Amino acid sequence: LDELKKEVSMDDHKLSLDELHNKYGTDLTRGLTNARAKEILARDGPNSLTPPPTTPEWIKFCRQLFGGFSILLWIGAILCFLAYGIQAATEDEPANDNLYLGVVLSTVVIVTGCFSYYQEAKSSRIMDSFKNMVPQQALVIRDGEKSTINAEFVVAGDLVEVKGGDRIPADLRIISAHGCKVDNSSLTGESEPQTRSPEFSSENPLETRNIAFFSTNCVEGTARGVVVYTGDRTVMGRIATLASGLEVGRTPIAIEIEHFIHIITGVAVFLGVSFFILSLILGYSWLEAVIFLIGIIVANVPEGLLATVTVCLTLTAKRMARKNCLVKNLEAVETLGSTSTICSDKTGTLTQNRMTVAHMWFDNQIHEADTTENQSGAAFDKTSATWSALSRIAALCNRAVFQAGQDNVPILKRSVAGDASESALLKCIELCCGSVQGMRDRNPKIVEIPFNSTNKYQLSIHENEKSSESRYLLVMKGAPERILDRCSTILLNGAEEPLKEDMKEAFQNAYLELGGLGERVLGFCHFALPEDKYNEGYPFDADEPNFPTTDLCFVGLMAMIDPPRAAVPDAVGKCRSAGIKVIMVTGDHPITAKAIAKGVGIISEGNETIEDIAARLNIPIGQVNPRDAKACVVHGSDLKDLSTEVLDDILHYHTEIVFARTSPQQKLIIVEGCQRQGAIVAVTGDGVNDSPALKKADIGVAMGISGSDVSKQAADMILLDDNFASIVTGVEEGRLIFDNLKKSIAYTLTSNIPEITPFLVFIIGNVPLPLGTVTILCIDLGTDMVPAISLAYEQAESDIMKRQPRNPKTDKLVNERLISMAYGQIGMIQALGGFFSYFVILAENGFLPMDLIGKRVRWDDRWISDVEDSFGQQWTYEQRKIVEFTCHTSFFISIVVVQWADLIICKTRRNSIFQQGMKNKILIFGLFEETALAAFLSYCPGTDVALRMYPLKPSWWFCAFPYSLIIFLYDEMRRFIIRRSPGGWVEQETYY
Amino acid sequence: RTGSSWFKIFLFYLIFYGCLAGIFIGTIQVLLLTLSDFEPKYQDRVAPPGLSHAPYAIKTEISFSISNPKSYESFVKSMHKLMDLYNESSQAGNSPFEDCSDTPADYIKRGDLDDSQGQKKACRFSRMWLKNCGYAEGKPCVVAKLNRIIGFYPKPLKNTTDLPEELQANYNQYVLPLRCAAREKIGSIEYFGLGGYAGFPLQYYPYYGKRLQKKYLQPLLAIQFTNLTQNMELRIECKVYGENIDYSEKDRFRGRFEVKIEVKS
Amino acid sequence: EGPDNDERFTYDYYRLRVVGLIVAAVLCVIGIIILLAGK
Ligand SMILES: *[C@@H]1O[C@H](CO)[C@@H](O[C@H]2O[C@H](CO)[C@@H](O)[C@H](O)[C@H]2NC(C)=O)[C@H](O)[C@H]1NC(C)=O
Ligand SMILES: CC(C)CCC[C@@H](C)[C@H]1CC[C@H]2[C@@H]3CC=C4C[C@@H](O)CC[C@]4(C)[C@H]3CC[C@]12C
Ligand SMILES: *[C@@H]1O[C@H](CO)[C@@H](O)[C@H](O)[C@H]1NC(C)=O
Ligand SMILES: [K+]
Ligand SMILES: [K+]
Ligand SMILES: [K+]
Ligand SMILES: [Mg+2]
Fold first, then answer.
1. Are residues B13 and A824, on separate chains, in Cβ contact within 8 Å?
2. Exposure of A423 by Cβ count < 10 A (0-12 exposed, 13-18 middle, 19+ buried)?
3. Is there a catalytic annotation at residue A345?
4. Which residues contact A85 (CB under 8 A, 6 or more apart)?
5. Architecture of the domain made up of A340-352+564-724
């Protein structure tokens, strides 16, 4: 469906103005007829974007109500009402058991539904942001007259007019223009104004001057044009549809959840029906056969687990909110940890998005300035008298000014009225020479010649601030070579000197080096005009050369670039140390893209492209073995004629990849290419041209300050302070939460065994029921909750940023090793500790373990109010039941006591508690509150009716203590083996 | 689903579960080692004695038809089961039985809950003390019973103040009374027991337990309802009175009966 | 005692409940203290 939109567009900028009118039945001068425009409206439809059909929240909520655990809990809830119905008909049961348990279980499903619904959130308003880029109104020429109309009423063929400050209402063929410049950052991510004129200037319509696009704005001048595309058919309207239309897809974390749901659901249905038939064979009435099944359901399903996961995710997202990293989708909290490839935009993401002075060439020396936002570098020069001469030209031969009321904000961050290069120079001098306004007050400008297309230079004449002179100084800047052809002397370390071929060659060298760094280079020179030849009232003519512009003194060079953000180089290296592959994907030109790649460490030192090898060896590129080149730089124009299989080979064959001059669909294609190889991919960006890629990414991260509204709609995560170091933190947090989820899951599952085994022995042994159904829910929904959550606050056991990204195909959240430990080893020890306390309670009340076998028949018989114990005493029905429920209560408390040790062992997968310590305060809180809850549930009056919880005698609490301790020792010995031999036996069997 | 590794994981879980079973058993050993053979550690959960009868009630109810044979043959099965134990052939010789007062007497202490003596000798009880009661084919002859509790001394109420069966045949010193009731007085209560009294003779106490007193016999109290009514559910409650006797709204068998007789004939 | 051994069939479930609830409360307070050591 969207495969059409993933392709590069076709256009009609090649046609003549006249020819273009024939195609759209239009007038170049009079414009369309009121009737013809209305006709075309009904024909083509409105100049608007329609949002894609969404899935209502209704269906979204209910889709969770049927996912493995909820299905089993539904079967339980209904099976409760089943047994209740069968009762209400047969023998009038005045009880509330099956009825209430059926109500409780149905509530558990609904509430669990809210948790998973909260986790599976999708806040997407892509198409809405795009719609915000179409103006409310447009100016059209109809019947030879200009009028404002609803922009939706704009059709292909009419004559539109735009001017500085307004949004392009539709894709236009420029037919007339006067000084028109446009901001195409929507399509390129670059905000430098692009001229628009009627002349065709490139085969590529996205590069030609005679096309203006919807989603962009006119920055200055005026233009008229013929509408060629409207609504969904515009270049960026298609990007809108592509972006808004892209299928979301399941996250890595989501896939893991479903996976263990299958496992646990599997064992649940297995043991469920495996013992349902095992009971009927033993001659159990279907009346009972279902009651046992309900218990089996409740025992096997970890009722509180899915909600635990959600809370652990939420708590991890809260910590990241506190580092200026907003998470829109709870699952995106983990994806960053599983990320193996980052596709990053350059401008406004890796870079500050601001022309900044990078180097200066004066005194036959290359000086480097500090490009960082917060200025974390050092000085270059202050002493040289040459510097002050260059500094003066940079301030004086400059027409840029700071906007009013910025004195509060830092120099480099403040808004400037002017072109990017003049702003850069302004901020450079203001920083290291103080107020520039002061320099422009001490040296009043009397005449100037602003930068001309033809002159290729800008000159200014000022009254020298010096009192002993107060004469006229000439300054000029422009193209380095043009400035050179106008110089005779060079200000070396203070004093001038003739411009010999020697210094002239050093100039060329300096010029070539700076240009090689991808930096824009300017020349600077001045000339102190002779006093006798220029009186204090001498008039200077700016129109006609009234003053010399030759034999001037060359002062120096200055170079500039849109520099990396301070934290970016280090963040890139850190991603790469964690084994994450970092690719650059930018709409910017290749020379600039490549230079920043080396600056931030995308391309490491020494690595070459095929073009680099060819130039170094002075040989044809076809003569170069492409396998000798680990780095590559792909232009979008070449990308366009490559198949995906060939794109896949590029991705496979290079470690250091730069995709430059890419369109928005091309970014999507590169992302998909990476994913196709089985990689989890993150995208980082800030422009509307990142929207499709951000949507398709497993996780999209947008910049918060510099980011466009669209990009932040398309993302899963926002960096609110533009701190790229947050990606590094995000991946670290993502890995940590993945491990801690394992700990929390194992902990929760472990207590399933002591809830399952009592029901089994109840059938096979014919003893009184050791633990009840209600009692199970008091564990999974009550006591285990806070402890399970607390594992989310566990510190790393080792340097997680030192390991490679997990293999999502092999490294699962819940594997066989977890089940073996939780179900086969620790849970089994917990089961016994439960049974022990059960036998203790009964034996101390007169029913010794031996006489318990095959007694349930008489025990449950409501009409036998005289059962004989081991000592020959006789018990009524309600009397023995009180002891039985007291058994449920102590078995319950036994679970809590054995979960104490389990909580401590689940703390660490490898390390010892004596190494990791007990610095998790939430965990300790869990221990205290868990025990408080259990005690309250046993001793609070009335709980014997609502939950069948009975007061325990002090000695009862200590039954499971020896089992709780064996768990601690056992797991500590086991992990001691793991560490002592990384070999594999204990490791490959039990290492979560 | 591994390789030959299936063996190594079998060798593990075999030894592992073996140890766990051996430990579980060990903790059961020590538990038993802390317990007496003659007396349970706790008795507060049987404390107030329950009162149970022979007619096995479907739901605290015994409804049947006099004009039908197999209508009551179900209740006669359980009635027989109990009384078959009070046979004279079961109580033979001076061991381990003893002839006790044919009239309600005081308690009898055979020492402590020790094995320092043989089987503590229990009082004989003749089912022949149960006058009038196949059993009552019309108007049932229910048999009451006080639940056995080791070392329990059932203490009758003293005639200090007012009483339900106000002072009639009040053998204050040696009888634990049992008065059945329904207002709703559409019946005819008739009690049979030891010495002809409507109670339990205190000479059968305290019970020394199964280990120290096997073949022991607890006193019975036969109750006959020769009601002149027919074809209606009659809620009859038999209540025992005493210092150590109490009741509960939950446990409807805590020192009392709940019988729903209906001679639907 | 002899016939006056009523205490054998008695248990102070009332005190046990009072003590149990005291303990539960204090464990609840202790937990808050440790948690609130930083929020
Ligand atoms: C318990 O007592 C009854 C009543 O005596 C015994 O019943 C048998 O003996 C009666 C004469 O004493 C006969 O009239 C009955 O037909 C006969 N009934 C049965 C069911 O056998 C009964 O056998 C005695 N049981 C024991 C075990 O001693
Ligand atoms: C109540 C009692 C009788 C039930 C005992 C169940 C035992 C036999 C179960 C419980 C957990 C189970 C193990 C759980 C995990 C694994 C790892 C997997 O890669 C192979 C099977 C294996 C090794 C299972 C074998 C059987 C097992 C040990
Ligand atoms: C009980 O049986 C005796 C004979 O043993 C008889 O005289 C008497 O009438 C019976 N009593 C009743 C109330 O039927
Ligand atoms: K469970
Ligand atoms: K995404
Ligand atoms: K559980
Ligand atoms: Mg950008």
1. yes
2. buried
3. yes
4. none
5. 3-Layer(aba) Sandwich (3.40)
Cα first-last separation, chain C? 57
Q: What is the CATH code of the structural domain delimited by A1-46+126-245? A: 2.70.150.10
- Contact of B57 with chain A, judged by CB distance below 8 Å, is answered with yes
Amino acid identity of residue B190, one-letter, is: E
Nearest neighbour of B47 by CB, restricted to C2, C3, C9 = C9
**Domain ranges across chain B:** 1-35, 36-265
For the domain made up of B1-35, the CATH class stated in words is: mainly alpha
Tokens for B160? Answer: 């200090």
By DSSP bridging, strand A365-368 and strand A341-344 are unpaired
Which ligand has the minimum distance to the alpha carbon of residue A683? Answer: 5
Is residue A695 within 8 Å of A714, Cβ to Cβ? yes
Burial of B128 (0-12, 13-18, 19+ CB in 10 A): exposed
Residue pairs between chains A and C whose CB atoms are closer than 8 Å: 53
Amino acid at C12: D
- The string of DSSP letters for A173-205 reads EEEEEEEEEEE-HHHHS--S-EE--SS---SST
Q: Considering the domain delimited by A353-563, tell me its CATH architecture.
A: 3-Layer(aba) Sandwich (3.40)
Q: What is the DSSP string of chain B?
A: --STTHHHHHHHHHHHHHHHHHHHHHHHHHHHHTS-SSS-S--TTT-SPPB--SS--SSSEEEE-TT-GGGTHHHHHHHHHHHGGG-GGGS-STTTEE---SS-------SSS-SSSSSPPEEP--GGGSTT----SSS---EEEBPP-BT----PPPTTS--TTTTTT--TTTEEEEEEE-----S-EEEE-GGG-SEEEGGG-SB--TTT-TT----EEEEEE--S--SS-EEEEEEE--SS----SS-TTSSB--EEEEE--
Residues of chain A with CATH 2.70.150.10: 1-46+126-245
DSSP string, A731-749: HHHHHHHHHHHHHHHHHHH
Question: How far is Cα A951 from Cα A66, in angstroms, rounded to an integer?
Answer: 39
Q: Name the experimental technique.
A: X-ray
**Two tokens, residue A166:** 């307004």
The pairing of beta strand A631-635 with beta strand A159-163: unpaired
* Fold: same for B1-35 and B36-265: no
> Which partners does chain B have (≥3 C-beta pairs < 8 Å)?
A, C
Question: What is the C-alpha to C-alpha distance for residues B213 and A871, in angstroms, rounded to an integer?
Answer: 10
Instruction: Provide the residue type at B69 as one letter.
Output: P
Residue A823 main-chain phi, psi, to 5 deg: -90, -40
**Resolution (Å) of this entry:** 2.4
List Cα–Cα distances, A540 to A94, A456, A525, A745, in angstroms: 111, 20, 19, 83
Report which bound ligand comes closest to the CA of A185.
Answer: 7
Of A51, A54, A53, the C-alpha closest to A237 is A51
Residues B151, C8: C-beta atoms closer than 8 Å: yes
DSSP A871-936: TS-EE-HHHHHHHHHHHHHHHHHHHHHHHHHHHHHTT-SSS-HHHH-S--HHHHHHHHHHHHHHHH
The superfamily in CATH containing domain B36-265 is Na, k-atpase alpha subunit. (2.60.40.1660)
Q: Is the peptide bond before B206 cis (omega within 30 degrees of 0)?
A: yes
Q: Name which of A442, A503, A499 is nearest A473 in CA terms.
A: A442
Check whether domain A63-116+246-339+725-992 has CATH 3.30.420.40, yes or no: no
If you search the block for the tokens 């009335």, which residue do you land on? Answer: A942
φ/ψ of A358, rounded to 5, equals -110, -40
Chain A residues within 8 angstroms (CB to CB) of chain C: 921-922, 924-925, 927-929, 931-933, 935-936, 938-941, 951-954
| Residues A627/A652, Cβ–Cβ less than 8 Å | no
Q: Which two tokens stand for residue A216?
A: 């962009």
Structure tokens at B93: 């010789």
Instruction: List beta partners, residue A366.
Output: A361
